[PDB]
């Protein structure tokens, strides 16, 4: 590609290991196969029936976040700020995320009653999921909504008349109009090329 990343240090946009912007509460599975059980035992909001905009679920994210002069948009998630040599250690008891530099350059994964090879096997990105994942994230069944029409409403079925003659009379009419327009423009160009009204008169004597 022709696009470069912008991973650099920044004094105003602190690193995500210190200011995450996104809501920093995550669950953690011992093995990612367990998420299949969460998906069949938790309820989904989209299965309940609501009728008014005022009854829609309220987000757990806060609207107060990004501040500044002439900053029009006020909510963001991700940034490319460089991580330092010794990042802050995530607090797993509060639900904080551990990923990337905060796994490799911290001791967050140590467990006194387990071998190290076992403990660190639970810190791959597929092991973490944000709170609210199962209740909210949609998984559509079609591009089409049952509240909207599709081809079943508009299809011409048995007993219908053939459309081919009309479709080609539509296109032919456009072309004999466009051909006349072209012929007229060329005839006007040729006239302009020919003698003018002032010289035609001088020849008559």
């Amino acid at each position: 590609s022709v696009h470069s990343h912008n991973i650099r240090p920044d004094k105003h946009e602190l690193p995500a290991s210190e200011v995450p912007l996104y809501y920093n509460r995550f669950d953690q599975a011992d093995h990612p196969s367990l998420w299949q059980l969460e998906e069949e035992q938790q309820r989904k909001h989209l299965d309940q029936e609501v009728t008014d905009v005022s009854q829609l679920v309220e987000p757990v994210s806060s609207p107060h976040q990004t501040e500044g002069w002439f900053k029009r948009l006020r909510y963001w998630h991700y940034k490319e700020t460089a991580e330092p040599t010794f990042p802050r250690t995530p607090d797993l008891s509060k639900g904080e995320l551990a990923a990337g530099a905060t796994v490799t350059r911290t001791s967050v994964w140590h467990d006194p009653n387990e071998p190290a090879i076992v403990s660190v096997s639970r810190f791959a990105p597929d092991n973490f999921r944000a709170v609210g994942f199962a209740e909210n994230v949609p998984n559509p069944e079609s591009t089409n909504s049952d509240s909207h029409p599709d081809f079943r409403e508009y299809r011409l079925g048995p007993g219908s008349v053939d459309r081919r003659p009309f479709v080609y009379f539509m296109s032919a009419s456009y072309f004999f109009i466009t051909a006349s327009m072209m012929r007229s423009f060329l005839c006007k160009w040729v006239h302009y090329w020919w003698v003018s009204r002032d010289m035609l008169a001088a020849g008559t004597t």
Partner: peptide, 15 residues
């Protein structure tokens, strides 16, 4: 109209 009335289903065929 041929793409505005098109149906695309994921998983299984509906109608």
């Amino acid at each position: 109209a041929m793409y505005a009335t098109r149906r695309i289903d994921f998983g299984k065929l509906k109608y």
